[PDB]
Amino acid sequence: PVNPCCYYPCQHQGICVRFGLDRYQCDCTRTGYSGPNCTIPEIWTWLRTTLRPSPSFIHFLLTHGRWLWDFVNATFIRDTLMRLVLTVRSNLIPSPPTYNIAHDYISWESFSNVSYYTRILPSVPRDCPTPMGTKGKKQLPDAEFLSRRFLLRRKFIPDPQGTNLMFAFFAQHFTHQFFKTSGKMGPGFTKALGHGVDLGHIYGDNLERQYQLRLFKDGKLKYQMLNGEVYPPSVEEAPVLMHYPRGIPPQSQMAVGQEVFGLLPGLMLYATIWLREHNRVCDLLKAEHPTWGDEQLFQTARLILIGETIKIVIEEYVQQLSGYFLQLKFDPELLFGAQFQYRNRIAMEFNQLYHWHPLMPDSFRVGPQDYSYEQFLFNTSMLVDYGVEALVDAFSRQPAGRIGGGRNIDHHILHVAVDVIKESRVLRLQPFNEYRKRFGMKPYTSFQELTGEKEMAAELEELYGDIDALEFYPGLLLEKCHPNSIFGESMIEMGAPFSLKGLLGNPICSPEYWKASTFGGEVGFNLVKTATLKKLVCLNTKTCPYVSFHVPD
Amino acid sequence: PVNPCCYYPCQHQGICVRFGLDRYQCDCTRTGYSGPNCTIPEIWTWLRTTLRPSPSFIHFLLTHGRWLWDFVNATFIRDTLMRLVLTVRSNLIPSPPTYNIAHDYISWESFSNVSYYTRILPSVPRDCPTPMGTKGKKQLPDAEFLSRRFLLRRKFIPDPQGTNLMFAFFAQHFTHQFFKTSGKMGPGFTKALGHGVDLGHIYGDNLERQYQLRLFKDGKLKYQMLNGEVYPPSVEEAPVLMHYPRGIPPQSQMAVGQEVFGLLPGLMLYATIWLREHNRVCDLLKAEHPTWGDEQLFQTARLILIGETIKIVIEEYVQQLSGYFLQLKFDPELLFGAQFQYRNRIAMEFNQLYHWHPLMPDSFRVGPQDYSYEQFLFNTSMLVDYGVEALVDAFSRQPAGRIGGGRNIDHHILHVAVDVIKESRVLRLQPFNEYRKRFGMKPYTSFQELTGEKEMAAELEELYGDIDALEFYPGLLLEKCHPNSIFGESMIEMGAPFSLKGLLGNPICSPEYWKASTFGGEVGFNLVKTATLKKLVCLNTKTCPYVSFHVPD
Ligand code: HEM
Ligand code: HEM
Ligand SMILES: Cc1ccc(-c2cc(C(F)(F)F)nn2-c2ccc(S(N)(=O)=O)cc2)cc1
Ligand SMILES: Cc1ccc(-c2cc(C(F)(F)F)nn2-c2ccc(S(N)(=O)=O)cc2)cc1
Ligand SMILES: CCCCCCCCOC1O[C@H](CO)[C@@H](O)[C@H](O)[C@H]1O
Ligand SMILES: CCCCCCCCO[C@@H]1O[C@H](CO)[C@@H](O)[C@H](O)[C@H]1O
Ligand SMILES: CCCCCCCCO[C@@H]1O[C@H](CO)[C@@H](O)[C@H](O)[C@H]1O
Numbered sequence A, B: 001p002v003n004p005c006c007y008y009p010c011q012h013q014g015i016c017v018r019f020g021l022d023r024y025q026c027d028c029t030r031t032g033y034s035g036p037n038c039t040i041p042e043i044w045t046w047l048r049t050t051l052r053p054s055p056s057f058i059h060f061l062l063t064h065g066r067w068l069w070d071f072v073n074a075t076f077i078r079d080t081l082m083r084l085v086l087t088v089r090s091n092l093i094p095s096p097p098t099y100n101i102a103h104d105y106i107s108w109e110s111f112s113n114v115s116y117y118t119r120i121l122p123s124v125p126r127d128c129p130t131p132m133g134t135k136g137k138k139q140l141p142d143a144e145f146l147s148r149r150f151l152l153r154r155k156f157i158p159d160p161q162g163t164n165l166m167f168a169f170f171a172q173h174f175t176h177q178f179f180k181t182s183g184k185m186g187p188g189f190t191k192a193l194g195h196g197v198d199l200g201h202i203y204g205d206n207l208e209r210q211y212q213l214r215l216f217k218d219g220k221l222k223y224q225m226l227n228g229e230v231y232p233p234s235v236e237e238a239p240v241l242m243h244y245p246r247g248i249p250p251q252s253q254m255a256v257g258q259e260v261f262g263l264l265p266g267l268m269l270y271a272t273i274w275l276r277e278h279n280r281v282c283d284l285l286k287a288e289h290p291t292w293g294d295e296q297l298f299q300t301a302r303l304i305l306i307g308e309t310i311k312i313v314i315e316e317y318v319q320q321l322s323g324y325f326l327q328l329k330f331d332p333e334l335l336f337g338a339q340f341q342y343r344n345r346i347a348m349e350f351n352q353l354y355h356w357h358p359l360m361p362d363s364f365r366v367g368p369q370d371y372s373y374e375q376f377l378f379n380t381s382m383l384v385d386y387g388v389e390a391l392v393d394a395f396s397r398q399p400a401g402r403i404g405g406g407r408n409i410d411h412h413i414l415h416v417a418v419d420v421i422k423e424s425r426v427l428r429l430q431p432f433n434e435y436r437k438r439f440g441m442k443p444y445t446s447f448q449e450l451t452g453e454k455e456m457a458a459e460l461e462e463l464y465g466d467i468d469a470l471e472f473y474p475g476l477l478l479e480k481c482h483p484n485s486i487f488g489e490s491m492i493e494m495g496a497p498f499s500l501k502g503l504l505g506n507p508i509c510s511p512e513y514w515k516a517s518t519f520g521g522e523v524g525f526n527l528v529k530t531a532t533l534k535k536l537v538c539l540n541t542k543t544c545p546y547v548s549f550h551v552p553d
């Protein structure tokens, strides 16, 4: 009595429920389809799919015809296409979340419990013949061998788009505020209950820790003065839990919101940048409101930083990644006339695919000197030895590593790539083609169609056996890319939805929160509308270095 | 240097922010008004208010013209008017939430922190001349004296609507799942973090307690067999925290989700009803899915009960209370084409006004025998001595007490009425007329306009002094009512919004959760669509008594 739902019968986001001893049914409610499987099109959906261009065809448009986009950008079409990218990508990702590691069905414990990582698709029944449902071999390839043959870096393959390490560290820094898989509770759980841009990696992840980081005067945060410059406080001044190595001295270890940030001068660099940005905002709010107290000056400055984050993440961060000629625009008012939920729940496949370790180089250049992985990791003095302005100049002048296609993952951080595929099997993620179906994409018929070449494709036909049994994480990294893209179709087509929901799904974007008084007048509401990666750095420094998400070139 | 925001300048939901030493400004963003105070109408809003009938005029329509509503009910207009009541009413309620006891401004702590009771309006700055802003006497009336002169019951004044005690106990039972003001954290905090219909008073309020209440087989809940009937388990069987009297003599103390439920046979009666309803649903789900396990059978049956609750709360509970000829209809699909947030946050004024102790009679009739407050409170054996069917028959045959107008609060429960007005001053709620402005109502110019008579009205002119300084809670109960109504115009026009937002704001109503598979096929999705107060009782009993929200008459 083989579980009928192991064949993934339900198509187009159909929920498969089990009936009787060996029966089943598919709920085709509002999926645009009917019938036993939700395959037979409705009158309107049939017309919509017939006039639907391939995802790659629309990517070609958004990456070609400069002249056309010089016009579109300077017209109201920048909003007709922006709102279209927003609503359409983010549709109904389910909102309110739908599953988690413990449940493969809509439940109140899944919507109420935040300590869970939601999941767009259910897991593969523990009662299914093969590990990935019905297709593939009885055993899946060795995680270590997959990383030493298809993910291991031989020669450095830079990003064709020019992306630099300044972007690489902004990604790891801004992404770790909603990715805190908890050791204790194990995989499928998170410590960052913000599940979005709550700047928990600056103040969070909890309140008890927040106060320890706050100076409690002028709504500022405690700090430390080294070489007449501003950095985070020493753990002595502000005693909070940090995952520093050793050992070490307490006087030389800075404290922030997100831990494991002291294990990289890059993450502590942005911890210093946003720190000076918070206190600077408190100086602007104190002058405007002498009557305001400590609590209001802080919690207000926090909303101002959260606004500057999304502003730089859309109009800058995704603009370098995207490579499009369409100027991405952060304007919450685009979905003010749309049926949109201002809620967000971090998925386990968003945490899964966001492991962009290929971005890390072979080493780390800093002007004349060159530090290796051994000299750069767990560095305590490097941050204060070079300063902020001199360091931001180095990262912006060094290219990062291409994420898609492979094989481009340094041998140092490859142990994470294996702990990601290992965590994939623990969560029991579905195959690669099943997720392709979920994000409006046609499944690959062969391994050669995935990589675009015969050599690895054949080396995979031996391991997995079937294409419908290919793993999720390995599928994204081994997929070929468009001519000068940073990663495969699937990384774009699956990642775009998740991030767009989480940005505009933020409370501040809603009609209730997107006022001028919410940021303490027009002064604070302008800082958000003019937020730039260049002003986030230079305004807090003395000298103005080279700051960008792409190398000079 | 008087705080300018103490005059409540901002009109029509305008946010007042303080500037300089003695200045201020009003944020008129999307309030439909502009100018210094948001008083000048916009082109469209001016036309909307000109064609806006008084709330009492629309009340009159919804309570008259029987012939017209016999037609409307049997037409698609039941949906045109239902959706209209939904969207319009619930749009007065901010979402996401706005403020809480600790903050008088939009902040991330206020949206992230759930242990808070949100609040529709900010508090009265402690740096204001008079306790209620600028109007009124330097001191507010004695809480005890107000309850002994305007709330104390002399002669029993029944509800003109026929409402009975069956409704009175369904109100206190269904309302205490989102009202758990924490005694530890003090006023302005809640233990029920569900902030809605999470049936936390059955399973909740937490997970550790939930397992203790569950049998862990067939997704059922532990129980106890007394006289061949089904009741909740003894604490011995299921050890959970309960607030039974001191040195109370268990065995015989039943355990449920919501505590302080053993202090009333009425609350333990509904704890038994919903208990048999959960296990019965598990029998229907087990037959349909023999393969299903314990976890899925329970968490699914939980969504089925949550659905039956809102179904009975709209088409039955608010039917009685409203006494409108318009058949209220629970259909989540009404706001599927509306800009609605499926989120909810319990306000402190919703907790405030929902104190309907006037509903409690002088005594409690049970067929032949009559028990007083001393014989009925903290009763442990009464529940199992009469059974379920014999008791539901008694409550449905006894009228309750009218809530509005006063003075109709038994001398036994009057100590709560004083602890509600006392909690009002702790939270620093705004005056009565200020909240009237918030919920689309014109402020009262005199105390005589509130009560509708000269005798109390004068006694109040002496105490409060000004009408703009009248307290919130006392304002609702002392307000006259339309002759056959259960409470004043303000109780309707402020409670209707809160209630409606929390019912359809529930996740299950959303487009993602409102499927048939979410309830385990059509079987479970039908139990929700045909949920009745009569089927909730009779189906779980042997004999069928008189069950309703109104006396026989
Ligand atoms: C020197 C560079 C880096 C090092 C040493 C590093 C180290 C690690 C380690 C040890 C883990 C543990 C995963 C596991 O135990 O399964 C991890 C996971 C992760 N990596 Fe990195 N990483 C680096 C760069 C990056 C970058 C550039 C990104 C960009 C997005 C990134 C994204 C993530 C995320 C989101 C997780 C999981 C977060 C969580 O579960 O809390 N990492 N990394
Ligand atoms: C015999 C009947 C009742 C008894 C003995 C009772 C008892 C109490 C007591 C002692 C409090 C403490 C409140 C304070 O200290 O300020 C309370 C709170 C409250 N009561 Fe009742 N009550 C009864 C009926 C009702 C009814 C019929 C309703 C609504 C229909 C109601 C609604 C509330 C609400 C909303 C609170 C707020 C407490 C919280 O937020 O946890 N009560 N009750
Ligand atoms: C994780 C993730 C995935 C996709 C996106 C995204 C969003 C958008 C936009 F425009 F919709 F905002 N584009 N866009 C995107 C599009 C193409 C590329 S590429 N270089 O791989 O071809 C890179 C990014 C962002 C984040
Ligand atoms: C706390 C509270 C307050 C109002 C309502 C409500 C909702 C509705 C409806 F129809 F919109 F659903 N009516 N309605 C209502 C209307 C009038 C009265 S009455 N007894 O003063 O005439 C009683 C109830 C419900 C709960
Ligand atoms: C199904 C009845 C539609 C109206 C008659 C038009 C001809 C049938 O329309 C069709 O229906 C199929 C359904 O899968 C479509 O896929 C095809 O276009 C066609 O066979
Ligand atoms: C001209 C481009 C404006 C429209 C933006 C289309 C968004 C990308 O395109 C579409 O995205 C949808 C969301 O992933 C998916 O249904 C499709 O697979 C994809 O093509
Ligand atoms: C026609 C709609 C706008 C004008 C309002 C007319 C009603 C005046 O207002 C209302 O009239 C009701 C009449 O039944 C009275 O019962 C209400 O108390 C009265 O306030």
Ligand SMILES: CCCCCCCCO[C@@H]1O[C@H](CO)[C@@H](O)[C@H](O)[C@H]1O
Binding pocket: B054, B055, B056, B058, B061, B062, B081, B084, B085, B086, B088, B089, B090, B092, B439, B440, B493, B497
């Ligand atoms: C048929 C009678 C009117 C029902 C449709 C209109 C919706 C009624 O809801 C209306 O809400 C407004 C704002 O919440 C209030 O000011 C009105 O008094 C209230 O009746």
